[PDB]
Design a binder for this molecule. Structure first.
Ligand SMILES: Cc1cc(Nc2cc(C[NH+](C)C)cc(NC(=O)c3cccc(Nc4ccnc5ccccc45)c3)c2)nc(N)n1
Length: 543
DNA sequence: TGGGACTTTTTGA
DNA sequence: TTCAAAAAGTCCCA
C-alpha cells in the first residue's frame, strides 16, 4: 500500500487545476488500484470539485442532470476508472465506492478485473494516476516474458523490469493534453536496462516534475528506492522540469502533514532541467554541480579509458574450492607456483592495499590430474559435483578443476591500480604485491605509451582527492543509501589532466604512500598533505 | 523479537 | 572463447 501522503500529493498534482466547468466529464484511471488508495481520494476530490461548482454547471449545462444528489451517480458512471488483476481488491474497492454515498436504481462502476498490459482499452483517459506493481520483478512466467518481449519491445528487453511496460501503457492510453502521475522504483533513471524506456518517455510526453527520494525508505519495511513522475501531453514550448532531490536520506515520511511541506523544506533541494538537453543517462544535478562538472570536463585532455586498460577480477565459480586461509595447512599440499595472493574489497584503502590474508589456487596452471592428484582430490575435489554444474564445465570449455573465469595472470601480476566496485568514497590503491581479486574489485593498468606521461602515484593522488570524489559522485549511479557503484563503464570515463602542478601532486602522493606504508604509522600528516594536494588540483582546474 | 546489510557467480553478448 | 554486468539469501543485535 502506498503511503497516504504520497497518494494525496499525486491526486492533487493532477487534478488541482482541472477546469470542471469547461469539461465536466473527466476520465481518471488507476491502472493498478489494489485496495483503491488512489481512487477513493480521486472520488473525494471530484465530489468536492463538483459540489463547489454545482450551480454553475446547472446554469450552463442541463439543469436537471446537475444536482447535488446526482454527483455520486455521475462520478461513478463517467469519471472514475480502475483496473486490477485481483478480484478481491476489485470487490473491496467497489464496495467502498458504493458505500461512499449510502438502491433505487443500478449504478455501473467502471472497474475492470483484467491484465492492464493485455487489455484492449476502448478509449483514452484525461488523467492517469497510481503505483505500478513491483513485487513481481523476475517472477514472470516464460510465456508472460515472451509476450512482454513481443508486445513491449520498445521498453522491455531481457533484464527490463515489469513496471517499464506499465509506463508505456500509461503513455499510450493518455488523452492528448492529459496528465499522468505515478510513483515507481527510481532505478530506471540511471540503470542501463531502462535506456529504451527513458528515450520513449522523453520523445513522447512532457515531464513536469521528478521527486527523487533516493535511498529513503518510502514504503515501510520494503527496500525499494522510489520516485514520483508527473507528465503531460500538452502543447508546451520550453518544457522545463522541476526536480526535487532529497538531501537527508534518513528522514521520516510520517513526520509531515503534507508532501509539499517536505518538498519545500531544507530536506529537499529543487532545480530546473531543460528536457530538450537530456542525455540518455539523465544526469540530474543543480547549476553549481553542473558548472563544476563542466569545468573539470573541459579542463582535462585525457580520460582513463584513453590511457589505461581495465579488467574485472577472477570469477572462480566456486570460491570455497580455490580460496584458502594463508595459515591453512592444506597450502603445504599446493606448490607455491600455483598460489596467488587474494584480497577482498575490505582490503583496499586509499593509496594502498592491505596485506593479503588469503591464497587463491590458480588451478588453470595444473596440467594433468596424475601429477597433482593430491590437490585435485584433497582440496578442489571437495566440491567437484558443484564444480561440474558450472556452465562452461557442462559445455566442455573448462575442465572441472579449473577456474571458471581465470582471466590472464599477466594482467594481475604487475603494478596496477585496484578499487572496490561499491564504496562510499573514492578508494583507488596502487597494488605492489601482484594481488588477485574476485569480481568485487576492479583493476586497471596504465598503457605502455602513456607511462611517460602518467604515473600510478599521480593517478591515485588525483583520483583519491576530494575534488575527484565530488566529480565522480556527480554522475555516478547511487545503488543504495551512502553507497555508489564504481564500475568501469563509469570509472573509465573519468577525465584526467596534466599541467605545471603535476610534479608537486606526484610528490605529495608519494609522501602519502610512504607515510601509509611504514609500520610506525600515524595517519595525521597524511590528511594535511591531502589538503595541500587538493589545493593544487583546484589550482589546476580553476575551481 | 523483529529487522536490513552485505559479496559470490550467472549469464547475455 | 571470454568479457563484464548484474542477479541473487542468510543471518545477529538491541
Ligand atoms: C546485517 C546482518 C547480517 C547478518 N549475517 C550475515 C551477514 C552477511 C554479510 N555481512 C556481514 C552483512 C552475509 C550473510 N549470509 C549469507 O548467506 C551471505 C554471505 C556472504 C555474502 C552474501 N551476499 C549476498 C547473497 C545474496 N544476495 C545478496 C544481495 C546483495 C548483497 C549481497 C548478497 C550472503 C549473513 N546477520 C545480521 N543479524 N544482520
Amino acid at each position: 500500500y502506498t503511503p497516504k501522503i504520497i497518494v494525496d500529493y499525486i491526486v492533487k498534482k493532477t487534478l488541482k487545476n482541472h477546469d470542471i466547468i469547461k469539461n465536466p466529464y473527466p476520465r481518471i484511471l488507476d491502472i493498478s488500484c489494489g485496495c483503491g488508495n488512489f481512487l477513493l481520494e480521486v472520488y473525494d476530490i471530484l465530489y468536492d470539485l463538483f459540489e463547489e461548482n454545482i450551480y454553475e454547471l446547472k446554469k450552463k449545462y442541463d439543469e436537471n442532470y446537475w444536482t447535488v444528489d446526482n454527483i455520486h451517480r455521475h462520478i461513478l458512471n463517467y469519471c472514475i476508472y480502475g483496473a486490477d488483476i485481483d478480484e478481491k481488491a476489485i470487490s473491496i474497492l467497489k464496495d467502498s465506492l458504493t458505500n461512499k454515498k449510502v438502491d433505487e436504481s443500478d449504478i455501473k462502476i467502471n472497474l475492470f478485473c483484467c491484465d492492464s498490459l493485455k487489455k484492449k482499452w476502448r478509449y483514452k483517459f484525461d488523467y492517469i494516476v497510481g503505483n505500478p506493481p513491483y513485487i513481481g520483478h523476475k517472477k514472470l512466467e516464460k510465456k508472460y516474458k515472451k509476450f512482454l518481449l513481443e508486445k513491449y519491445s520498445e521498453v522491455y528487453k531481457d533484464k527490463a523490469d515489469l513496471y517499464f511496460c506499465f509506463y508505456k501503457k500509461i503513455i499510450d492510453i493518455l488523452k492528448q493534453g492529459g496528465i499522468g502521475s505515478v510513483i515507481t522504483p527510481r532505478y530506471f533513471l540511471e540503470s542501463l536496462s531502462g535506456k529504451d524506456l527513458r528515450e520513449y518517455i522523453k520523445s513522447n510526453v512532457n515531464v513536469q516534475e521528478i521527486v527523487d527520494f533516493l535511498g529513503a525508505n518510502i514504503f515501510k519495511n520494503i527496500g525499494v528506492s522510489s520516485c514520483i513522475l508527473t507528465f503531460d501531453k500538452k502543447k508546451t514550448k520550453e518544457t522545463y522540469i522541476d526536480v526535487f532531490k532529497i538531501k537527508n536520506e534518513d528522514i521520516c515520511i510520517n513526520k509531515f502533514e503534507t508532501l509539499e511541506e517536505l518538498l519545500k523544506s531544507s530536506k529537499f533541494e529543487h532545480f530546473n532541467i531543460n528536457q530538450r538537453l537530456l542525455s540518455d543517462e539523465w544526469i540530474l544535478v543543480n547549476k553549481d554541480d553542473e558548472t563544476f562538472y563542466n569545468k573539470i570536463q573541459e579542463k582535462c585532455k585525457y580520460s582513463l579509458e584513453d590511457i589505461a586498460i581495465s579488467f574485472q577480477g577472477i570469477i572462480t565459480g566456486c570460491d570455497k574450492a580455490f580460496i584458502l586461509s594463508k595459515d591453512d595447512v592444506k597450502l603445504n599440499l599446493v606448490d607455491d607456483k600455483f598460489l596467488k595472493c587474494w584480497i577482498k574489497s575490505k582490503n583496499i584503502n586509499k593509496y594502498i592495499v592491505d596485506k593479503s590474508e588469503y591464497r587463491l589456487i590458480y588451478s588453470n596452471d595444473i596440467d594433468n590430474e596424475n601429477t597433482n592428484k593430491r590437490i585435485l582430490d584433497e582440496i578442489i575435489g571437495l566440491y567437484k559435483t558443484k564444480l561440474e554444474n558450472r556452465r562452461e564445465c557442462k559445455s566442455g570449455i573448462r575442465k572441472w578443476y579449473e577456474l571458471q573465469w581465470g582471466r590472464e595472470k599477466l594482467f594481475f601480476e604487475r603494478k596496477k591500480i585496484m578499487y572496490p566496485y561499491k564504496s562510499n568514497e573514492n578508494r583507488f590503491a596502487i597494488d605492489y604485491d601482484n594481488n588477485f581479486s574476485s569480481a568485487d574489485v576492479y583493476s586497471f593498468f596504465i598503457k605502455e605509451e602513456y607511462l611517460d606521461k602518467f604515473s600510478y602515484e599521480y593517478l591515485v593522488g588525483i583520483l583519491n582527492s576530494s575534488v575527484y570524489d565530488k566529480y565522480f559522485k556527480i554522475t555516478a549511479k547511487k545503488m543504495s543509501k551512502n553507497i555508489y557503484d564504481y564500475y568501469p563503464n563509469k570509472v573509465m570515463k573519468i577525465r584526467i589532466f596534466r599541467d605545471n602542478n603535476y610534479e608537486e601532486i606526484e610528490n605529495l602522493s608519494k609522501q602519502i604512500i610512504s607515510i601509509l606504508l611504514n609500520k610506525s604509522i600515524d595517519k595525521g600528516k597524511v590528511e594535511k598533505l591531502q589538503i595541500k594536494m587538493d589545493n593544487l588540483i583546484m589550482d589546476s582546474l580553476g575551481i
